[PDB]
Design an enzyme around this catalytic site. Sequence first.
Site, mmCIF file in Angstrom:
data_model
loop_
_atom_site.group_PDB
_atom_site.id
_atom_site.type_symbol
_atom_site.label_atom_id
_atom_site.label_comp_id
_atom_site.label_asym_id
_atom_site.label_seq_id
_atom_site.Cartn_x
_atom_site.Cartn_y
_atom_site.Cartn_z
ATOM 1 N N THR A 219 -3.546 -5.598 0.695
ATOM 2 C CA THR A 219 -2.968 -4.265 0.881
ATOM 3 C C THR A 219 -3.869 -3.432 1.768
ATOM 4 O O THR A 219 -3.355 -2.583 2.495
ATOM 5 C CB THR A 219 -2.712 -3.525 -0.446
ATOM 6 O OG1 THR A 219 -3.953 -3.193 -1.092
ATOM 7 C CG2 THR A 219 -1.923 -4.346 -1.461
ATOM 8 N N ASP A 220 -5.178 -3.701 1.772
ATOM 9 C CA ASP A 220 -6.014 -2.978 2.743
ATOM 10 C C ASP A 220 -5.666 -3.296 4.171
ATOM 11 O O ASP A 220 -5.785 -2.476 5.077
ATOM 12 C CB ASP A 220 -7.472 -3.360 2.455
ATOM 13 C CG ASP A 220 -8.415 -2.580 3.328
ATOM 14 O OD1 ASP A 220 -8.685 -1.386 2.996
ATOM 15 O OD2 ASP A 220 -8.911 -3.113 4.349
ATOM 16 N N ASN B 34 21.191 22.174 -10.640
ATOM 17 C CA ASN B 34 21.652 23.579 -10.770
ATOM 18 C C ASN B 34 20.522 24.321 -11.481
ATOM 19 O O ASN B 34 20.392 24.092 -12.664
ATOM 20 C CB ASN B 34 22.976 23.631 -11.494
ATOM 21 C CG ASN B 34 23.649 24.981 -11.433
ATOM 22 O OD1 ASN B 34 23.049 25.960 -11.055
ATOM 23 N ND2 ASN B 34 24.898 25.051 -11.841
ATOM 24 N N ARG C 258 28.432 34.125 -10.130
ATOM 25 C CA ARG C 258 27.127 33.750 -10.652
ATOM 26 C C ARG C 258 26.220 33.433 -9.476
ATOM 27 O O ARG C 258 26.635 33.267 -8.341
ATOM 28 C CB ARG C 258 27.155 32.533 -11.584
ATOM 29 C CG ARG C 258 27.654 31.284 -10.896
ATOM 30 C CD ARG C 258 27.695 30.049 -11.766
ATOM 31 N NE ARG C 258 27.978 28.832 -10.999
ATOM 32 C CZ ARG C 258 27.949 27.618 -11.518
ATOM 33 N NH1 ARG C 258 27.679 27.402 -12.800
ATOM 34 N NH2 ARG C 258 28.208 26.591 -10.729
ATOM 35 N N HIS D 64 19.267 27.229 -13.145
ATOM 36 C CA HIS D 64 19.971 28.372 -13.722
ATOM 37 C C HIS D 64 19.188 29.668 -13.700
ATOM 38 O O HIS D 64 17.979 29.688 -13.947
ATOM 39 C CB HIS D 64 20.307 28.019 -15.167
ATOM 40 C CG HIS D 64 21.099 26.765 -15.317
ATOM 41 N ND1 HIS D 64 22.353 26.568 -14.768
ATOM 42 C CD2 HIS D 64 20.770 25.616 -15.972
ATOM 43 C CE1 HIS D 64 22.770 25.321 -15.083
ATOM 44 N NE2 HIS D 64 21.844 24.731 -15.809
ATOM 45 N N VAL E 192 29.348 22.995 -8.199
ATOM 46 C CA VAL E 192 28.415 22.245 -7.339
ATOM 47 C C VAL E 192 29.082 20.997 -6.814
ATOM 48 O O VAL E 192 28.917 20.664 -5.633
ATOM 49 C CB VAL E 192 27.133 21.931 -8.126
ATOM 50 C CG1 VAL E 192 26.137 21.110 -7.319
ATOM 51 C CG2 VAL E 192 26.464 23.237 -8.567
ATOM 52 N N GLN E 193 29.822 20.318 -7.664
ATOM 53 C CA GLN E 193 30.582 19.127 -7.268
ATOM 54 C C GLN E 193 31.440 19.341 -6.038
ATOM 55 O O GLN E 193 31.434 18.547 -5.096
ATOM 56 C CB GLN E 193 31.429 18.699 -8.456
ATOM 57 C CG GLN E 193 30.763 18.146 -9.682
ATOM 58 C CD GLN E 193 30.301 19.126 -10.741
ATOM 59 O OE1 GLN E 193 30.055 20.275 -10.446
ATOM 60 N NE2 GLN E 193 30.107 18.676 -11.982
ATOM 61 N N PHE F 19 32.353 29.420 -11.832
ATOM 62 C CA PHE F 19 32.457 28.206 -12.657
ATOM 63 C C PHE F 19 33.325 28.548 -13.862
ATOM 64 O O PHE F 19 32.912 29.153 -14.845
ATOM 65 C CB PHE F 19 31.053 27.649 -13.013
ATOM 66 C CG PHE F 19 31.159 26.287 -13.664
ATOM 67 C CD1 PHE F 19 31.702 25.277 -12.888
ATOM 68 C CD2 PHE F 19 30.801 25.965 -14.943
ATOM 69 C CE1 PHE F 19 31.853 24.018 -13.414
ATOM 70 C CE2 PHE F 19 30.918 24.706 -15.491
ATOM 71 C CZ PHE F 19 31.459 23.709 -14.700
ATOM 72 N N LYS G 171 0.857 -1.189 0.000
ATOM 73 C CA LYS G 171 0.000 0.000 0.000
ATOM 74 C C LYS G 171 0.894 1.241 0.000
ATOM 75 O O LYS G 171 1.818 1.320 0.806
ATOM 76 C CB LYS G 171 -0.917 0.025 1.201
ATOM 77 C CG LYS G 171 -2.095 0.937 0.998
ATOM 78 C CD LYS G 171 -3.115 0.443 0.001
ATOM 79 C CE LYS G 171 -4.519 0.261 0.526
ATOM 80 N NZ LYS G 171 -5.315 -0.544 -0.478
#
Lengths: 295, 295, 295, 295
Positions: free
Chosen positions: C57-58, C254, C176, C256, C227-228, C159, C10
Site C-alpha cells: 500500500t505504500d 430533512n 415550513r 428539522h 422532499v421526495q 407537508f 491506501k
Amino acid sequence: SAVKAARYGKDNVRVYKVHKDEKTGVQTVYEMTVCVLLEGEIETSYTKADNSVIVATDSIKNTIYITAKQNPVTPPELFGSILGTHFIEKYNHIHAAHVNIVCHRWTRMDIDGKPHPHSFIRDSEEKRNVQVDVVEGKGIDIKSSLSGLTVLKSTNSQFWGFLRDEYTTLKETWDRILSTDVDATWQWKNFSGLQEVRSHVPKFDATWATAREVTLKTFAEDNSASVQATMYKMAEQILARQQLIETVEYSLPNKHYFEIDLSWHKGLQNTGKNAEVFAPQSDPNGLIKCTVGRS
Amino acid sequence: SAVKAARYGKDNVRVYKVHKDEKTGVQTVYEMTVCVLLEGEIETSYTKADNSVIVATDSIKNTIYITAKQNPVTPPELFGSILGTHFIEKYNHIHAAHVNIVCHRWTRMDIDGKPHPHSFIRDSEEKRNVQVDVVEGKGIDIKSSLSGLTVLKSTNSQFWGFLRDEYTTLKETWDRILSTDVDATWQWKNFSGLQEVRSHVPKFDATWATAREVTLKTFAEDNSASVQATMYKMAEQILARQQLIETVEYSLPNKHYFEIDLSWHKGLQNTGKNAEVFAPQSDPNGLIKCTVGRS
Amino acid sequence: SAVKAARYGKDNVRVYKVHKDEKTGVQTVYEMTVCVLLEGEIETSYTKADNSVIVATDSIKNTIYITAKQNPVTPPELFGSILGTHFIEKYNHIHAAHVNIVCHRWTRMDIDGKPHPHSFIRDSEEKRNVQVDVVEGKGIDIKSSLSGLTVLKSTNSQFWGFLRDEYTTLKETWDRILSTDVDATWQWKNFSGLQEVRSHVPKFDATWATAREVTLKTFAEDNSASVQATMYKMAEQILARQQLIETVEYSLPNKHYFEIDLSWHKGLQNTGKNAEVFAPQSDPNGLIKCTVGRS
Amino acid sequence: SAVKAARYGKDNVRVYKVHKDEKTGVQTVYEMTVCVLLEGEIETSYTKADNSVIVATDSIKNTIYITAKQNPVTPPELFGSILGTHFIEKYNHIHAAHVNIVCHRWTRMDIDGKPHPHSFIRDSEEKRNVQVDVVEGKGIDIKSSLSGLTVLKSTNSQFWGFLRDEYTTLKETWDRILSTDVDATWQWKNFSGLQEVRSHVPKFDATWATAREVTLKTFAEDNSASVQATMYKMAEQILARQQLIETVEYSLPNKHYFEIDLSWHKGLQNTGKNAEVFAPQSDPNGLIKCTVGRS
Ligand code: NA
Ligand code: NA
Ligand code: NA
Ligand code: NA
C-alpha cells in the site's frame, strides 16, 4: 501599534514511546499529543521581519522527539516540565515555555485472564492532560486534568427548589437521569524549578488516581441535589487528600435525557414512575463550573 | 424518467431504555442510535406529490419509541427484527424495512470493588451494531458487527516479501508496530421471519462475544505476516464457532507509526533495534478488507 | 473457509497539485483526498501469508503521487480513470482498481474586485467526488457526485396529506422551513476504457455544473410538496440534460427546524403565521433517498 | 474548602430567526449557537444544596428564545449585550452574565443572476463570533471575531533567516505554500452599558467587514517573511481603521504542505522550482499567536 503579547510554536505533535523490558519481554507503550508555545524577546519577528529570534517550529518539533528519546515521558507533569525547562535554559531570549500534553489510553490486554506483554487496547477516549507553564524567574506552574470521562446514573439525581418566575417552565423532579462528561483539573502549588517537580514525581500519578476515584465514587453514591452540589463534594475531597494542590476546577455538562409521553398512544404510560424509554438530547446542555480552593 | 429505487425514513433516533429490578434495586441501561428506512409502493410520492403513501418519518420516530417501550431492546438483532417486522406487517404497501442500530456502551461501575446498582461508564467508543433487512416474502437478513475497537501491538508484526518494482520504496521489516480500528461483521443465515429470529436469541450475544474474543486474542498472539493473514485467521475461527453465520467481513486500517531517525542529532540511535520514539501518522493509512465464507 | 471477496490499498492520501502559467503568472491549485483499493489474484496473501502478490500500500501511495505528477488531476473522473487503469495494466494479477476521490474547494480570491493570481479561499466544505471502478474486461464505471451542499429555504415548503393512523402525531403544515445537505450522484454509462473516458472529458465538468445548478434552482423555486417530490424533479432534469448519464441518485436529510410555543410567556405569539424564532434540531432527521433512471 | 469562582448556564442553544418583509416578500434568516453562563451570589448552591439561588439552566434557555423573539439578533454584539444585561438586571443576586454567540452563514442564493427572496446556502463553515461579558458595576466587555476562514497561497511566502543550532533540520526557503485557518479577534473599548453599545451599532458589522477585508488582502498581497510578520500587518491596519478597538488578536496555524521528492522514480523532478505535487500534512502544525495594541 505595538505587540502586547506573543507566543508561537508547534501544535498537534503526536508522540509514541515504547519501553522494552529485556529481561521479562514486557513492553509498555505511551502515546501523547504535545503542543509547545514559546514566549520571549521575539516581538521583532512580528514587527521587523527579524527571523533571527525565531526558534523554528520545526525545530521545536525535533526537540520534542529528542526529549522523549532521552527522558521519561511519564508522568506527563515531569515530561512537560523537562521540555519547558529545556527551552528557557537553552535560549537566552526565550523566557517562557507553555507545554500542553494530552495522554491517550493504551491499556494492556488481558488474554485468557493473563496480561499480554505487548498488546494494548484503547479503553476509551478519556484523556489525562497537563498544562505546564515554565516561566523564567517564576518557576513551573502545573495544571493536571482528566477529561472525556463519560458517565450516567439512572436514578438518585434530583432537581427541585430552584428559582421560579415568568421565565420558568421546568418541572421540579425528585428522580431523574444524570449524565455528564467529566473535565476535572487540579492546580499544583508553584514549583521553583525542575528539581522541585522531580521531588514530587510519585504524587502526580497518585493524585490523578485519587481524582478519578473520588469523581466516580461521589458521582455513583451522592443522591445528587444538583450538579453544583455533587461536583463541590468531589473537589473538597480531592483537596483534603493532596495538600500540594491549591485548587480544583470542574466543568460538567448536564447531558439531558428527556422523558417521552406516550399516553396519546393506547394510553401508554412512560412518565414519572413508569418512565422507561427516554430521548437523549444532543443539545442544548447545561454547563456547570466551579473552582474550589482552601478556606 | 422513472423511479428505479426509493427508500425513506428517520435517521439518528437516539433511544435510552432502563430496566429496574424492583426486588434487587439493580438497574440496567441501554442506549442506541436507530435508523429505519422503508421501501414499498411509494413511488407516487416522488413522481406525483402523492403523500398518501407516506408513513411520515415523524411517525416512524414515534414507532421506534413505542416499540422500545413494549419490547426488549436487547439483543439488538431481535429489537431490529421486531421493529422491521412491524412496518411490513402494519402497512400493506410497505414491503421492506431497513433497520440500522448502533449500540453505545454503558458498563456498570465498580465502586470499591463492588458493582453499583445504577451507575455506568462509557468504556470506549467501541460500538456493537446491527443491520436488519426485513423484506416481505424474503425473511429477515441480519448483519451483526463490532466497530471502533482500537488496538495496538508494539512488536510481533512483520511485513516482508511484498512485490518490489520501480514504484516501491518501502523497506522490508521483521519487527514493526501494528495498530488498527477493528470493523468486523458476521452475516447470519437468512431467517424466515421473527419466529426464527426469536428461536436463536441466545446466539446473538454469544457470537458477538466470540467475535470480540477471537479478534483480540488473534491480534495479540499472531506474529503477523501481514494484516491480510491475521484477519483471515480471525474470520476462519469465527466461522468455525458459529455455524449459523454464512460470512465474516473485516475492514481494518493500518494506522502507521513511523520510526524517527535522530542520528543527525548527536548520533542519537532511534531506528531498528534502538527504535523507541515513533511518530504516529494520522494519514494516509493502509486499508485492508476481506469477506470469508465457507469452502 | 475460503476468501469470497478481498480488496486492499491506501486510503486518506492527501494530494495537492499546482499549475503555474509561466506567461501570465496565474497559478491554479487542486487538492484532493484519494483512496485506491485493488482486487485480483491476491487471496494467498490472506490464506498462506504469501506477500509476493501484494503491491504494497505504500507503493500505491507513491503511484498516486507519481500519476498526479505526470497527468492532469482534473477532471477527477479522468484522473481516477488514469490511475485505475494503471494498476490493472501494470500488474498482471490485479484485475480491478477502485478509486475514490474527494475534491476540496480552493476558489480564487477576488481582491479589490480583481481575481488574484495565487491566493485561494475554501468557500465551503461542499465536495465534488468520484468513484471510478476500473475492471479488467469490463471497462470503467464512474459515479460522480456533489456532497455537503447545505441549503435552507424559509418558506415554500409544505407537508400535508401523509398517512395518519394511531402512530401519528405530526400536524399537517402548509408552510415550513426546509433545510438539507445535498448528496447527489450521477452514474455514467459504462466506458470501454481510458480512450472512451478521454473522448468525453468536457462533459464531466459541464455535468457537475448542471447538477449543481439544477439542484439549487429546483430547491429555490419548487413550492415543495415533500422532499421526495422536489428531489425527483431535480433528477429528472439532470437526466434530460446529459444523455450519457444512466441514473441519478439523491440522498437528502430533512434537518428539522421546530416552532417554539412561547404563549406561556406573556401571551407571546410565535407559532403559525407569527413564527419567527425556531429551534434547529440536531437529531433525529428525516432521510430521503431515490434513484431515478430512464423510462 | 471554599468556592473561589463559579459560573453555570446553558450551552449549545441553537437559534434561528426569520425576518419577513411583508411588502417585498423578501425574507432574511439568522442562525446562531448561544451559550449563557451566569455568576453571582450562587455559592450556596454548591456548598449547601441551596437551589433557591439557581436560575434554572432550562429557564436560561427559555430566556434566550424570548429575547430573540423580542429583539434584533443582529449584530450579535448587540444581541449578546441585550441578553447579558437582562440577567444582571432581572436577578438581584446575579452579578455577571457571559454570552458567547457563534453565527452561522446563510447567504442568499443567486438564481439565474438574481437574488432569491427566501433561499440560502451555507457558503462555508467560517463563523462570526462574539464574547460579551456583562458585569454589574463594570459595564460590557465585547470581543468580536471571525474564525474558520481557510485560505491558501501557492507562492509569495518565504521562511529564511531563522535560528539554526543542533536541533535544527529545516531548510531555508524563498518560495513555499502558506495555508491557514484564520482566527482573528478585536476587543472593543469597555462600554458603560447597553445604551453605549446601542450608540455604536453600525460599527459592529462595519468592523467585521474591515477585519475580513484586511485579512484577505494582506494575506493575498504580502510576500510573507513569516506568519508572524504577515499577521502583525493585518492587526496594525485593523487598529488604524477603528479607534474603538483596543487590541487585535490573531491565532494562525501553519498548515504545512510538504514537497515530495520523486527523483528515485525515473529521475522525476518535483522539488524546488519543479515542485508541482505536494503532500498536505494533517499534523503537526505551527501555531502562531499575537495580541497587538496601541503604542
Ligand atoms: Na531563556
Ligand atoms: Na406490507
Ligand atoms: Na491486470
Ligand atoms: Na443583578
